[PDB]
Amino acid sequence: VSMTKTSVDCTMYICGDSTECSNLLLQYGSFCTQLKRALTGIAVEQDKN
Amino acid sequence: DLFLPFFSNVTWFHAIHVSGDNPVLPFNDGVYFASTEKSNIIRGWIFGTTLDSKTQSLLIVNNATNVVIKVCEFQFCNDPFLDVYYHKNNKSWMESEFRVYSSANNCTFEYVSQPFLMDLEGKQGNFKNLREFVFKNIDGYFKIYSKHTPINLGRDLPQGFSALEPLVDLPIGINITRFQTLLALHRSYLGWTAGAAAYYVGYLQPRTFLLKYNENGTITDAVDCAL
Amino acid sequence: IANQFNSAIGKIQDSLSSTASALGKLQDVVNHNAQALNTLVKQLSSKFGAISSVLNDILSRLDKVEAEVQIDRLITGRLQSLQTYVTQQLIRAAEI
Amino acid sequence: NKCVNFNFNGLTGTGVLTESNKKFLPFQQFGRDIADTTDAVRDPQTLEILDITPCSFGGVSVITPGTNTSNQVAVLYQGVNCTEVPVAIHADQLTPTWRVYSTGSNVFQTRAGCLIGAEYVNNSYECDIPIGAGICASYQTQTKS
Amino acid sequence: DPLSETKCTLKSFTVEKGIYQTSNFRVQPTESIVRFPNITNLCPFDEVFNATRFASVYAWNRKRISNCVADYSVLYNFAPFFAFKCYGVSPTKLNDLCFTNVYADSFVIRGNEVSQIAPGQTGNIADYNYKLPDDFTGCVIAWNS
Amino acid sequence: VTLADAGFIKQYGDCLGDIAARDLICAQKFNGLTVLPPLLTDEMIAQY
Ligand SMILES: *[C@@H]1O[C@H](CO)[C@@H](O[C@@H]2O[C@H](CO)[C@@H](O[C@H]3O[C@H](CO)[C@@H](O)[C@H](O)[C@@H]3O)[C@H](O)[C@H]2NC(C)=O)[C@H](O)[C@H]1NC(C)=O
Ligand SMILES: *[C@@H]1O[C@H](CO)[C@@H](O[C@@H]2O[C@H](CO)[C@@H](O[C@H]3O[C@H](CO)[C@@H](O)[C@H](O)[C@@H]3O)[C@H](O)[C@H]2NC(C)=O)[C@H](O)[C@H]1NC(C)=O
């Protein structure tokens, strides 16, 4: 009926709290927000199901 | 990395001096070497490309305490071995002459180190003990790993598990192609004195293994992925 | 009819008490969501052509112009690892 | 037991250091995890093995009625025990600069996380905003007395 | 405040009723800790650069550096050096950083052939005298002598 | 059916020390991967 909800800190997964990695990651724009949104979409659906 | 393949065909050598034949071994990729001999009759090794002073070569000699390692244009003898005997002028036991080589020419590297791999704590009544070594030569660096384990008298090289810890490392900076091992013959003056020396050799190969670390962080099992 | 039903419910308890894998359709969902996160955390070890996968090694050993071409490989590969995980989870979520 | 930047033999990083239960073999300097990152180290001055654990962290979620309905909000520290929010007080530096929620007085432990700025009430209602683990939150007048 | 954090997370000046995931909190490092081995003598490598004569390149001389403080700056201030070319490290980091085994390979070269000391090159020095790996970690230093 | 996490509180005392050597959930959590709890508890589903 459902599966485990998951949330990801995109920033912490890609960059291990490096600030210069985080400043490079901003060159890629909205992809981290798209991932977060998509996972939030999946997670909210498990309760709906 | 570079391992002894599982269930692989190892050579088992018996050597004996017989009181009143032993051609040089190849050394390709690296060597697993193992022995179970009592009374320290097996000591050390030669490794080299030519062994006759035309090019540099490696010598390792153990004795009753500490090791010497030397890298040199040695002219080795066709039978290199170590003698230790009672010298009456010193009233004690030591080596007479370095009958492993006819000459040592201009050597390039000289090294000395801790004894390693003694017999059991206070010895025991012929319950046995296996000593195991790995010798590897990569990027001009010569790496030594070893272990020993007590073994009950089923048979030597028993089924079970134990991994070799690294023990010594040295950048000999030379080609290796062949090798030999030094016996300690007892040579009791009243002349010579016979003794046997059993040892196993098994060359390693470039291989992938899956290693099972237990919660203590020791390799308690492995799979040879090409067996 | 009651005795047949009462014995048929009895066989459900016996079947669920004896057999290992009858709930495989639910355990497979747990196993796939666990395998996917273990896979995603494995891809942190991957170098993607950088000198190390460990971000702190690069920042211990390089300076702020040649470090960046290492860090950018790791960003590129890790961002692809998340885009793969999230696509696989969006596809799984449609099956669920 | 405190969050620090560390450097062991050039191995820079950030974490809390702790007495490990790990029996390193004498030839080993570093111990490592499934993500290929160092999680234990042998101190080079006194030969003891330290666990490294990353300094405490978590997701944050903000619970709001409509902005046209109110400007007041509640904050969920997701996956956090509320006894660790007394460590998340801005006495040392934290990522969220808005310390004011940390004033508490109405702090509540949900199994989803520590929930702050929302008062827990016994009388159940339909789920308005879902917090998780059976808890929901709503904006309304509470005047039972 | 946490409402303003949602407004920037949503890029909207009005936020409708809901629960919104925002920037993850982290406890920051309280202080900086360094642990190197408490060995004290300055490295003997100055005695190689100041030698009466260097090795010939067909027999290039390799020296172990061990158990010592590698303060490279006072060495770079002992003699003018024409090159520095570090490959696996940046020269600025060499103070903050520790080493497992350090070997100086030392010899004399015509200025033309210094071009072949770079990793993976080809030419008489690199082909037959002295081949460092195409992936070696270290620095090449040279000066007209 | 035996679960790998259910999204409930880990008090950080759970995560440090020995458990990170034996439970993968910690490696996951220390890399920003979080299992969230369901809105209805198993008691709340048993009621329905
Ligand atoms: C095992 O064999 C080793 C040699 O293969 C041997 O090492 C040698 O030990 C002696 C005594 O310590 C040293 O002799 C020198 O001692 C001082 C040095 O200042 C001088 O008074 C002497 O005249 C002499 O030069 C040797 O130098 C040393 N050889 C090496 C290569 O270091 C071990 O002692 C042997 N072990 C046992 C238990 O006998
Ligand atoms: C990993 O290393 C551990 C430490 O050496 C080891 O734990 C030790 O295990 C032995 C054998 O079970 C215990 O020996 C005692 O066992 C019982 C009492 O618990 C008695 O009947 C015995 O006579 C004996 O006193 C040690 O006490 C125990 N040590 C500790 C600190 O727990 C683990 O077993 C090792 N891991 C593996 C996989 O074996």
Ligand SMILES: *[C@@H]1O[C@H](CO)[C@@H](O[C@@H]2O[C@H](CO)[C@@H](O[C@H]3O[C@H](CO)[C@@H](O)[C@H](O)[C@@H]3O)[C@H](O)[C@H]2NC(C)=O)[C@H](O)[C@H]1NC(C)=O
């Ligand atoms: C329709 O199917 C029924 C089975 O689902 C069947 O009921 C079974 O009938 C037999 C007897 O014919 C019973 O067997 C027992 O009978 C007595 C004890 O009561 C003993 O002498 C026997 O050794 C044996 O224990 C079954 O217990 C009974 N099963 C159930 C669930 O009641 C009907 O007889 C069938 N009817 C027709 C018309 O075919």
Ligand SMILES: *[C@@H]1O[C@H](CO)[C@@H](O[C@@H]2O[C@H](CO)[C@@H](O)[C@H](O)[C@H]2NC(C)=O)[C@H](O)[C@H]1NC(C)=O
């Ligand atoms: C070790 O062996 C011999 C003898 O010491 C050395 O050969 C001599 O080398 C010098 C210097 O190049 C020449 O002047 C002689 O003419 C050489 N003698 C012969 C007979 O050829 C050899 O160079 C030494 N090697 C090392 C590494 O020291």
Ligand SMILES: *[C@@H]1O[C@H](CO)[C@@H](O[C@@H]2O[C@H](CO)[C@@H](O)[C@H](O)[C@H]2NC(C)=O)[C@H](O)[C@H]1NC(C)=O
């Ligand atoms: C939040 O963390 C604290 C510890 O910081 C937990 O308190 C412990 O709880 C157990 C069980 O009741 C007691 O045996 C301990 O003595 C308590 N320790 C302290 C220092 O008070 C608390 O239970 C945790 N809460 C949740 C919801 O997990």
Ligand SMILES: *[C@@H]1O[C@H](CO)[C@@H](O)[C@H](O)[C@H]1NC(C)=O
């Ligand atoms: C090992 O190889 C030799 C040939 O080199 C062969 O005579 C011997 O029987 C082999 N033994 C096994 C167990 O394969």
Ligand SMILES: *[C@@H]1O[C@H](CO)[C@@H](O)[C@H](O)[C@H]1NC(C)=O
């Ligand atoms: C620091 O150096 C001194 C002098 O050699 C030594 O006694 C001490 O043991 C060293 N410190 C530690 C923690 O070992």
Ligand SMILES: *[C@@H]1O[C@H](CO)[C@@H](O)[C@H](O)[C@H]1NC(C)=O
């Ligand atoms: C906000 O609430 C008021 C009533 O308080 C309502 O009239 C208005 O239409 C609402 N606006 C929005 C954007 O929800």
Ligand SMILES: *[C@@H]1O[C@H](CO)[C@@H](O)[C@H](O)[C@H]1NC(C)=O
């Ligand atoms: C809920 O009711 C109990 C008495 O049944 C009371 O002790 C408790 O204080 C109430 N909860 C709150 C949040 O006050």
Ligand SMILES: *[C@@H]1O[C@H](CO)[C@@H](O)[C@H](O)[C@H]1NC(C)=O
């Ligand atoms: C080089 O070493 C000698 C001692 O052998 C010393 O006198 C000299 O001062 C050193 N060179 C410099 C530039 O200090």
